[PDB]
Every structure is written in C-alpha cells, then in structure tokens.
C-alpha cells in the first residue's frame, strides 16, 4: 500500500540546458563544386534529407537569444575557416614600396574627386637580380603620403602586411545546417508571435537547422529569414541605450548595387609562382558605384517600423531618424560584399526622416576599398583582387539594426540612429528559434513493486 | 470523433504526456542516444563525450541492481519528505519535466541510497550463497 518503492526509468524524456560543440551539414548538392570554392564544402559533413521536425505538444519553453550560446561558436569557427581559406593564399609582402602616384586620366571635375590613384613603383621579378618597374591603379582609401613631388605608400604597410586572395575561392554565402551530436536536441520555437525572450508555448524538436547563409553586413541585414506576419522588433531593455534594436521586417526590400567601371585585370609576376592580379585599364568612364531602393517601398517600411516602435513607446510619439552621428568607415556605412568586391555605401538619404502619429528610386553612392580588415583584428588585412567587367548585384534587405538615442528628458521625439556594432547580432537573427538541450534520461519515480529475492 | 489527427510517436514523442503514456515507450529516447581536418577533431571530442556520458549513466545503472532491464523495482521505501504527493495523481496528472523540478533537491540522496541498497542486497546474496 503506502510502502512505495523507488523504480528508476531509463530512456525518459527530460533535458537540461547545456552547450557543446555543434557541427556542419553542408548540402550534398553543393559538393559538385570542386575543392573549396567556398569555405566548408569538402571539410564538413554532407547533409541529410527531411530533418525530423517533430512537434512537442503541451510544451512551453523559456527561450532566450541574448544570453544564448551557439552564436559565439558559429562566429568563432567562421573566423577560423576564414583564416583557413587564407592560409593557402599568397602572402603580399613585397608590395611595401614607396609608391609614386598621380591622378588617373579622366575628365577631372572639381566636384568629383580622384578616387583612384596611379601609383607606379618598382618590384622584384622571379629572378633575384632583375627588378621590374610596374604600375597599377589604387584607391584613395588605400594610400597615404610619405612626407615638389607626391609619393604615397600603402595604408596597411604600417603594422600589417597581409595576403592576396586566390581566385579559386568565392565569397558567396552557402547554406549551413548546424546539427547537434548524439544526446542533444535542438528546440525550435514555432510561435508566430515571439520576441526575443519569453516562454514559447509551441516548440518542435529538430536535429539539424535550416540552411543558414553567412553574410557580413553591418547595417541593412541581407538575404535571410524574413518575418512571418508583422514587422517584428526585439531587443534587451528597450529603456537601454546601449542595446541595439534588431528590426526584422516582413517583406523584402530589393537593392540593386552595381559598379559601372569595367576595371580590366592584369597579372604581374611577383616571384616564383607568385602571381599578383592588379587592375590595369578601366574601359569607358570613371563613374560612381551605387545602389538603388524603391522609395515607395522604403517609405512604407518606415511606416511599418514607426508603428511597431510606437507599440513600445506609446502613441503620439514623434519618431524621427538620423544618420549614425560618428564612427569609422565600417560602422558609419553599409559595408558589404557583392560578387567578391567590397562596397561601402552611405545610408544617409535613408536614415533621415520624422514621423508624427497623424516610382522613383533612392540612389546610394557607394565606394570601394581593396584591403579589408573585417572583424577589426589586430594583425590582419585582406587584399581583395580586382574583378573583370561591370559589376552589378541584386539583394534583399531583410532586417535593420537600429539604436535609440539616449535621451534624458520628457520629450516626445526619439531620434533613432542605425548602428551595426557586433556582427554576432546578425546571426542572432538566425539563431533565435533554436536552443540546444541535453537529453538526460534515467529518471526515478516511486511505485508499489519490490525487487523479489 | 473519427480520430484522424496526426500523432508523432517518434523521438521525445510523449515528452509532455502523462506517466502512464510516457512509460509506454521509453526505448525511443534510449536508442537515439549513441548513433544519432580540424573539424574532425571536434567530431572526435564530440564522440568521446557522447560515449562518455553514455558510459556514465550505464555505469551508475550498472552498479545498482539494474543491469540492462531499463525498468526495475528496488527495496527502499519512499520517504514522503521527498515528494509528499499523492500516488493517484503523479502517474496521470503531472509530467516528467514537472517531476525533474519536483525532485531535483532530493537527487544525490536517492543515488546515495541506491548504492547501499544494492550492495547490501548483494552481500546478503553472498551470505546466502556462502552457507550453501
């Protein structure tokens, strides 16, 4: 009767929150492209079909995306395989020579400025005796003057000699299905109304995530994971001034970034088997690379996000925007990649409005930089090689990363300003549905049976 | 009433269900527990962590009276200071996740009780075997 006895139960559904190393699942269709034209296509695992997304009825679960893990590991290893895709490539040491640069041959108007400098120098051939005298073209954001005459040098020649990039690899994002090891599940919040934290009363268990594309944009998140119904915003303390406002809107915004210089390449021989690709002539005219968005789309989307911001800050609140007051060139700008070249645009015709509770396109003048110090590491940069022909791309702006302006008065306006900051928060726009649990079987419960002897 | 609703009798299937329906299929969480040049050593150290945490529960189960039975009675009575709940509820009212919160203080008392209740039954079996 009341003599209840302990009975253990092995293989019992319970889990605890934990954190262990997850792994890839590259799509098997992406295995046809030979020997790492993108990072992690031969290195890690071919995926599975139909991952067992299985419902968990009568289950609520306290998710989190700010104290979440697995966005630190994905940023960690994506840093690591970014260095893995740079260890085979050729070091670009012998370019640190005192340049001599003039204006490029162009119809120089005083309003426009010379973006590209000529920079003819000396450089050793594969023979140690001879030294060819070669010329190139270089952007103004890559040379500084050593101080008549006018002679420059590379900007990164101080403190960081850094490699070229092998034209076999490609900087496109491929989908990545992260999978848990044995004994660990991946909870996916299926709630169609779900901000950052909070119990998600409709979960489902998977083993491998959907295909994540790793992109690198500071402002204007691109090409991934649009929202379902509304424009969903999510943050930490919305009464904090240091926490970004990860905007995620519902309909995509089409961008039309291009580069209209032809920009012919040529191969200079550095040494034994060390080619260096430098931009030779530019065919046509020297015109500015730009991007386009639809003004009818952009103003309606700001009409959406000014409604959802008033959902958190009340009505009759005069929401206005401004243009990210200061910072470096990689935080004040919409810094991104397009086809293998690095556009730095100027979102200041965008983030300039004011909203009260009562066909043409917007053109963004971008600019290109060839050495690259993505993630702002100490002793790295990255000489992106030039690319042939006119360059043009089309992408979907999916989410913003806003930042409030830390007022301290009883005003109504809230001059919001965009700001990227840490790149992990981009991937928090991809890893908010998923938490990783550890299956912990072998529970124990009393019932009325005894081990007979 | 025709009962056409879909049911997913798969991994972690009854994870919200009652004890009388969760103990129907315990093997499904059991069997999906072992199977399923620098990112290969994360496979090595993920595998030998999986087989390690498999061996740890298979050792703690092994050194009790439950070799591979996966469900087994014991001889220790159930002190009501642990749970103080009725019996007629806790097999059809609550759920297993409610149990792990309801007992987690009282674990490491039960695991300590199990070792003497096994080794005492073990040596009493030897004292029974020695006389014959």
């Amino acid at each position: 009767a009341e003599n209840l006895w302990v009975t253990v139960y092995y293989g019992v559904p319970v889990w605890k929150d934990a954190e262990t190393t997850l792994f890839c699942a590259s799509d098997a269709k992406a295995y046809e492209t030979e020997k790492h034209n993108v990072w992690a296509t031969h290195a890690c695992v071919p995926t599975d079909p139909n991952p067992q997304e299985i419902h968990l009825e009568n289950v609520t679960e306290e998710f989190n995306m700010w104290k979440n893990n697995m966005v630190e590991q994905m940023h960690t290893d994506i840093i690591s395989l970014w260095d893995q895709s740079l260890k085979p490539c050729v070091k670009l040491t012998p370019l640190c020579v005192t340049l001599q640069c003039t204006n490029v041959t162009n119809n120089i108007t005083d309003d426009m400025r010379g973006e590209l400098k000529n920079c003819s120098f000396n450089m050793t051939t594969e023979l140690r005796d001879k030294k060819q005298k070669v010329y190139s073209l270089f952007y103004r954001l890559d040379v500084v003057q050593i101080n008549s005459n006018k002679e420059y040098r590379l900007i990164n020649c101080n403190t960081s000699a850094c490699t070229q990039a092998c034209p076999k690899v490609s900087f496109e994002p491929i989908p990545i299905h992260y999978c848990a090891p044995a004994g660990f599940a991946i909870l996916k919040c299926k709630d169609k109304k779900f901000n950052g934290t909070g119990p998600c009363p409709s979960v489902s268990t998977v083993q491998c995530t959907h295909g994540i594309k790793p992109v690198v944009s500071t402002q204007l998140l691109l090409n991934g994971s649009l929202a379902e119904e509304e424009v969903m915003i999510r943050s930490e303390n919305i009464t904090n001034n240091a926490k970004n406002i990860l905007v995620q809107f519902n309909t995509p915004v089409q961008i039309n970034c291009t580069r209209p210089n032809n920009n012919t390449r040529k191969s200079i021989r550095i040494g034994p088997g060390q080619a260096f690709y430098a931009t030779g002539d530019i065919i046509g005219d020297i015109r500015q690379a730009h991007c386009n968005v639809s003004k009818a789309t952009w103003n309606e989307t700001l009409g959406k996000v000014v409604k959802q911001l008033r959902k958190h800050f009340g009505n009759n609140t005069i929401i206005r925007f401004a243009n990210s007051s200061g910072g470096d060139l990689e935080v004040t700008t919409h810094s991104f990649n397009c086809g293998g070249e690095f556009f730095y645009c100027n979102t200041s015709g965008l983030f300039n409005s004011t909203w009260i509770s009562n066909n043409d396109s917007i053109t963004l003048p971008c600019r290109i930089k060839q050495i690259i110090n993505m993630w702002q590491r100490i002793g790295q940069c990255m000489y992106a090689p030039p690319i042939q022909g006119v360059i043009r791309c089309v992408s979907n702006i999916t989410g913003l990363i806003l930042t409030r302006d830390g007022g301290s008065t009883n005003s109504t306006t809230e001059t919001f300003r965009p700001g990227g900051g840490d790149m992990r928060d981009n991937w928090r726009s991809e890893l908010y549905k998923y938490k990783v649990v550890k299956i912990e079987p072998l529970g124990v419960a009393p019932t009325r049976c005894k081990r007979r002897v | 009433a025709v009962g056409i609703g879909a049911v997913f009798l798969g991994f972690l299937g009854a994870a919200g269900s009652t004890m009388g329906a969760a103990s129907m299929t315990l093997t499904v969480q059991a069997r999906n527990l072992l199977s399923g040049t620098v990112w290969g050593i994360k496979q090595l150290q993920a595998r030998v962590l999986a087989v390690e945490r498999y061996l740890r529960d298979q050792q703690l189960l092994g050194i009790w009276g439950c070799s591979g039975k996966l469900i087994c009675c014991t001889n220790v009575p159930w002190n009501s200071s642990w749970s103080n709940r009725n019996l007629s509820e806790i097999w059809d009212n609550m759920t297993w996740l409610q149990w792990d919160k309801e007992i987690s203080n009282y674990t490491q008392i039960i695991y300590g009780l199990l070792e003497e209740s096994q080794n005492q039954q073990e040596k009493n079996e030897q004292d029974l075997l020695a006389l014959d």
Partner: antibody
Amino acid sequence: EVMLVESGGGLVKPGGSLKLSCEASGFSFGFYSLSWVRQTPEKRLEWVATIAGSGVGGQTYYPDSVKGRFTISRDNAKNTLYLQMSSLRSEDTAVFYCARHGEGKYGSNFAYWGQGTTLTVS
Amino acid sequence: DVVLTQSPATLSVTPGDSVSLSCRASQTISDNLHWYLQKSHESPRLLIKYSSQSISGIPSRFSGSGSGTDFTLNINSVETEDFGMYFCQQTNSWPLTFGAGTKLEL
C-alpha cells in the same frame, strides 16, 4: 511552410480512369492523414477519400458514391498523395483538393488545403 | 451520412457589423465541428476548429460556439476581407461531410 500542390486533372470521358497527384513539402509527410475533398461546380464541398497517417493506422476511407471506384494512396518517400479514379460519372466533375489534417487529438479537421485540380467528366 | 445544414445560405452585411452563422447536424457532432472560409478563386481556409477552437493566423473576430447538433460561428466585426463562402464540417462519423455554406457578400 506546408504546401500541397495537386496535378493530373483533365477532361475525361465517362467510364474512364485518371490518377491525381498531390505533391507535399514542409512537414513530416507520413505522420499526417491526408484526404481528397472535391468542390462541385455549385461550390458544395464533398469529402472524396482519406488515407490515414503513419500514427493513425494508414487505412483508406471512401464514401459510398465512390467506393469501389476511387483509390487513395500515398508515396511517403516522395511526399505525394494519389487518387486513382475509375468508372467515372458526370457527377464526379469538380475541383479536387488535397488536404492535410492537424495534429493530435484536436487534429482530425482539415488543417491545410491545396489549390485544387479540375476534373470534368462529360 | 451526416447532413450539415448551414443557415443562412447567403447573407449581406456591411463591413464592421457582426454575424452569427448556423450549422445544424442530423446527429450529435458535439465538438466535431470546424469552420472554413473559401473566398472566390481561392481554396478554403480554416476559421474554427472543434466547434470553438480558434486558429493561429485567423483574426480574433472569428469565434465559434455550439454543442451537440446546434452550432454558431460568430464574426464580431466583419471586415471586407471576411466576405466569402462559409463551411462547417464534421468529424463525428464517416463519411466526412460539410455544410452547404453561408455566402457573406458586401
């Protein structure tokens, strides 16, 4: 998302045969029960056939007006539902929808409907 | 077979008004009753599950009630997008059957 896309509809002479297909994606196909329901030119909805899901028993069900004539089947590996119709009648003329049921106890309802494919028997 | 009788067959209401749609079963289908909206040129869309259960993504203005044989679908401020053909459906017995629908026009 859950998608059911039917094909195979057409104009059939009476007495003929026709196999409809429904191609599904976005869910664990075998677990859900699936049905064909038709909508007549007067817009009335008539259930046509059901095949239960893997955890439902996987049997087939038909109303008397089609029994012995219509056959519902599934190919779970390709996530496709089929309806093989024989001894067709002019009354079979309708838009045929593939439909997916819900989950658990409160899931015998139709949860998702396809776009439909048209069958005309005359 | 279970005959489901929806009343009225057609109903005209101004957007913003509220409506009560009737479905009556020939046998008890106590909670076996679902409501679907089929707009013109579209597939039907589930409004209410098991007499009264609301559906994620369906506006809160859709509500269901009723038990046994007599059922009611309330729409408590009808919007322009709500106009269409309304079906009730039973799962109490084979064969599965629908009501004839209420057509709500503007």
